[PDB]
Amino acid sequence: RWKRHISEQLRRRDRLQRQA
């Protein structure tokens, strides 16, 4: 499910990679 919430983020603002 997170794939839909990340697919748009990782594509726009992939700032989660640093958040972990």
Within 10 angstroms of residue 11's Cβ, the number of other Cβ atoms is 8
3-state secondary structure string across 4-20: HHHHCHHHHCCCHHHHC
What is the experimental method? NMR
What is the rounded CA–CA span in Å between residue 18 and residue 8?
16
What sign does the CA torsion over 5, 10, 15, 18 have?
A: positive
- Residue with tokens 């640093």, as numbered in its chain: 18
Contact criterion met (CB below 8 Å) for 16 and 6: yes
End-to-end CA distance of the chain: 17
